[PDB]
From a paper:
Coxsackievirus A6 (CV-A6) has recently overtaken enterovirus A71 and CV-A16 as the primary causative agent of hand, foot, and mouth disease worldwide. To initiate infection, enterovirus particles progress through a set of distinct functional intermediates: the infectious native virion expands into a destabilised altered or A-particle, in which the internal capsid protein VP4 has been displaced. The genome is released through a capsid opening, leaving the empty capsid as the non-infectious end product. The major capsid proteins VP1, VP2, and VP3 are arranged with pseudo-T = 3 icosahedral symmetry with VP1 subunits forming pentamers around the fivefold axes and VP2 and VP3 forming heterohexamers around the threefold symmetry axes of the capsid.
Residue numbers in the entry:
A (entry chain C), D (entry chain C): 1 to 174, 187 to 233
B (entry chain A), E (entry chain A): 62 to 204, 215 to 292
C (entry chain B): 30 to 138, 144 to 251
F (entry chain C): 1 to 49
């Protein structure tokens, strides 16, 4: 009505206040919107797209070589091929993924991850890797025997070129992360005139139950 | 310890991601010493700072309304009763050449008259592109490479409404809030340092996306 | 007869986003059984004892195995405190369940931080230094806002308290967070005449209720 | 409407004004609330819980001994064991109770109190105490005979270990308190090889009709 | 003389008990003499003063929204047109290092721009804990004893929006009103003097809860 | 209602703001409008000549 009192918060500019302001050009008609393919209304859709993990993020490795996990014929048995933590937020292989980049724009996230492994050796190459997941409680397994006792997958190259690993739950707050280890279950076996070295490409993504809390500017740029 | 529940989906939306009023320019209206201009012309640049440029370049096409807030004061934070004119110069309109040029009196250039002692002026600029969306990436030639003139949003010419020099510099902090944002065609986040303001140019010294570690088998950095 | 803490029966946690993808382990009688701790000797000069939960069962039997080798834990407890006193013994014990029993240090008028032996006394428990302030700067007289039972040697020699899971989170780490403390404090000191047993045994029996574990290592 | 007058009380910050202010983080979704046992929505529920009275609050008594009323074999008869005022607000035994602590956060209170006595002697010990209540009008009774004429309870140890006394009404304003006295109705009687000394624990609480007015900061801390 | 009636139950509620805006911090923005910082970072502490710490520690778990009011002036109570920035730094966000650090321009840190001549700025901070409630008592280790990091509510970084030193100290009185409070698991009120800010530590010289009297039979102190 | 906060954009004169202002001469009745031929309500009609 006509009687009025001005309360505290009068004449303040709060940068997060979603108020209304008068249009600068009233009766201006913007260009009508045509259909454009590929509209996205959520960053979780981008989090759910598989992107390459930079697992070979070692000193001296440059360029596309950092995206390849080397697999070769081993003199020793039951050796560890590669390990990485399933931690989208912190520095490491997940920095190269879309979910890893989006998590740095937020403070807290939780949900299930998805890791896919792609074997890119010859059609004639065969063998087994043991892919083991260790929950955030424990440290890295010391032997293939120890890794076989926890959550693991035995992966055969000659049958399946790709396997999906699902990490049941990770979380972060203002890391509590598991570890993925790849073991040489068998020797790398090839016929004659076949390369004895191959690569594994690791991809990472978020599941349908991943979420983000408290938007926070990134420290990458 | 561990976030047992989910954080919801509201803050992962594109609308929330590109929201909140953010500093897009610090405009100085110099009136003293060697610089007695008494006015400034500021081109509206949504990508003035790298933090906002990287967030916007997650999209290819983007349609939104912009709300601008001008936070103005003197060098010593004082806000006396000085009268200021905030003129919006629409794309393809002449810009002021001096403190008392005739473009300050053009009726088709909307103006805000506000005092420094008033709460900050606020106004909404609509979607301005001749196309259905703003193009952060245009792969072609106007008739330099990649320089689309459809992303011109206009100019904010700011002056003190005064006859001769006042001897006082006015600092104007321009805050912009993106409204009703629609984004098309997700893109990878920029991983290289920006070299120039309008190009994807990067230095030959290429930085690795992921931080280095000692070996592919160790989990300590 | 039985004190139900906050009028809340212990139960299994409702559906959780984290527990939906991998259903939590619900152990049976093998884990949810009676654990009888070492007996405490109540004497005239005794100041009282306290135990942390589930720190008291963290290195004991199958429950200790589950607690150490699981990332997350949730359980209620049924605790029995029994005395073996003659009708010629007199004294009053207060049995109190203190949720988030943070033990304070005492600074000489400088130990401002209690050591691990006081914060996590284990299955043997810890004796009170200042039972008047419960070793936590809060008066013993007002400790009856917590779930409690009296043991008056002339009326009853046993107390039973059922404590449900009480936390700001549906699950937590058993090894580094104690949900509640169980304190037994002699209010009226033990008195007896020459020729009686000089100590009254105090026995604590614990039964985990609706134990839940997640993320086996 | 558009016409408006600002009244007195404009631009004032009243610390008790329950107004509305804009959220600092709009679209932030707090952690959803799980069920937690032991929610309390009223300080009167805490006032109605029995807590130990510090009746033995004498000079030189330290620690848990201050909560115990000593009872022993008396050479004389009809002696007074202990007395205390039923005054939750002022200094004395009620300071150690929850109702005594809450009353110091308020200026005015009224209602009925509840006092429970617990005998903690041997099962073999027997005797009688006379528990007398004097209303706020009178002074402390001088003899057990005088106390027997007013409101009183004769309490036998051998039959009941605990008795509840109800004070019909106390009040306070910006003390008008009664007095409780404990008399030796009989001698303390024990068989041989039984301690001749025992203790009474006094507990205090508020009834369902107790209330509090005008919230006032405490002088304890 | 005597309050014959009952006082009602409204003021004994937990909602009323923890209500009314109260001083939680006096922030000094020093800009002159030996301290020419021109800014201050104030950690949000609901338990800054012992009076409020004792009232909050009546509960174990507590969930609420906080409304903050900034009452700002100079040394001599004057309020000229100086412009101030009140930045809220959410938990787990970087804090300003200086008067012109880049964190002052971070869009995800909400800011209030207000003049000293304006009525006091006011804003609501939501429930911020990763848990369902704030824990005043956490009996455990993060991985010091009893130091739960889930009670971080954020930081208020306050500066004058100025280029060089102004020579004026600004006193900011921060007032906080708890809103929509829910409390769990009642606890005894603290009876010992607080030694440190984050611990239940007390001195070996233990003070008696009840004031002393001459004898258990006398009613005069 | 009676409680009120003034937002940014208070006390600003935006030259394109189509607000309301009080009449200088309330109860003044302008000359009634007669029919005049050749009313035009659009510049596109002139563009089409």
């Amino acid at each position: 009505g006509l009687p009025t009192e001005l309360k505290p918060g009068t004449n303040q500019f709060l940068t997060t206040d979603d108020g209304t302001s008068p249009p600068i050009l009233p009766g201006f008609e913007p260009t009508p919107l045509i259909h454009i393919p590929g509209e996205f209304t959520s960053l979780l859709d981008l989090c759910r797209i598989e992107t390459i993990l930079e697992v070979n993020n070692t000193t001296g490795t440059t360029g596309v070589n950092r995206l390849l996990i080397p697999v070769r014929a081993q003199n020793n048995v039951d050796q560890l091929c590669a390990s990485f933590q399933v931690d989208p937020g912190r520095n490491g292989p997940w920095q190269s993924t879309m979910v890893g980049q989006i998590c740095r724009y937020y403070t807290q996230w939780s949900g299930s991850l998805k890791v896919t492994f792609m074997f890119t050796g010859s059609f004639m190459a065969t063998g087994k890797m043991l892919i083991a997941y260790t929950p955030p409680g424990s440290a890295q397994p010391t032997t293939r025997e120890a890794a076989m006792l926890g959550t693991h997958i035995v992966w055969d190259f000659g049958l399946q070129s790709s396997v999906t690993l699902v990490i049941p739950w990770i979380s972060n707050t203002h890391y509590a992360t598991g570890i993925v280890t790849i073991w040489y279950q068998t020797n790398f076996v090839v016929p004659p005139d076949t390369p004895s070295e191959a690569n594994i490409i690791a991809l990472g993504a978020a599941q349908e139950n991943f979420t983000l809390k408290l938007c926070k500017d990134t420290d990458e740029i | 310890r561990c976030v047992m529940n989910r954080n919801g989906v509201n803050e992962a939306s594109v609308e929330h991601f590109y929201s909140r009023a953010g500093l897009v320019g610090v405009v100085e209206v110099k009136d003293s010493g060697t610089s007695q201009d008494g006015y400034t012309v500021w081109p509206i640049d949504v990508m003035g700072f790298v933090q906002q440029r990287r967030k916007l370049e997650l999209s290819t096409y983007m349609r939104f309304d912009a709300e601008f807030t001008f936070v103005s004061n003197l060098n010593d934070s004082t806000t006396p009763g000085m009268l200021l004119q905030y003129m919006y110069v629409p794309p393809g309109a002449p810009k002021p050449d001096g403190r008392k040029s005739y473009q300050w009196q053009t009726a088709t250039n909307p103006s805000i008259f506000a005092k420094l002692s008033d709460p900050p002026p606020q106004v909404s600029v609509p979607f301005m592109s001749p196309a259905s969306a703003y193009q952060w990436f245009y792969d072609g030639y106007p008739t330099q490479y990649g320089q689309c003139p459809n992303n011109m949003m206009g100019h904010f010419a700011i002056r003190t409404v005064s006859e001769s020099t006042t001897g006082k510099n006015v600092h104007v902090r321009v805050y912009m809030r993106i409204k009703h944002v629609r984004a098309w065609v997700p893109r990878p986040f920029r991983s290289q340092a920006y070299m120039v303001k309008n190009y994807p140019t990067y230095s030959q010294t290429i930085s690795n996306t992921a931080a280095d570690r000692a070996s592919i088998t160790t989990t300590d950095y | 007869n039985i004190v139900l803490s906050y009028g809340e029966w212990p139960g299994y946690c409702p559906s959780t986003d984290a527990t939906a993808v991998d259903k939590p382990t619900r152990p049976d009688v093998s884990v949810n059984r009676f654990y009888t701790l070492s007996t405490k000797s109540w004497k005239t000069e005794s100041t009282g004892w306290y135990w942390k939960f589930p720190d008291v069962l963290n290195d004991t039997g199958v429950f200790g195995q589950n607690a150490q080798f699981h990332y997350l834990y949730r359980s209620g407890f049924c605790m029995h405190v029994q005395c073996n006193a003659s009708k010629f013994h007199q004294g009053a014990l207060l049995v109190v369940v203190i949720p988030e029993f943070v033990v304070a240090a005492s600074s000489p008028a400088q130990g401002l931080y209690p050591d691990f032996a006081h914060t996590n006394p284990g299955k043997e428990g810890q004796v009170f230094r200042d039972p008047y302030v419960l070793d936590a700067g809060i008066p013993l007289s007002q400790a009856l806002v917590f779930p409690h039972q009296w043991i008056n040697l002339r009326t009853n020699n046993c107390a039973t308290i059922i404590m449900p899971y009480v936390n700001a989170l549906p699950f937590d780490s058993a090894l580094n967070h104690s949900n509640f403390g169980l304190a037994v404090i002699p209010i009226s000191p033990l008195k007896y005449c020459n020729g009686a047993t000089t100590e009254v045994p105090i026995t604590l029996t614990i039964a985990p209720l609706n134990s839940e574990f997640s993320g086996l290592r």
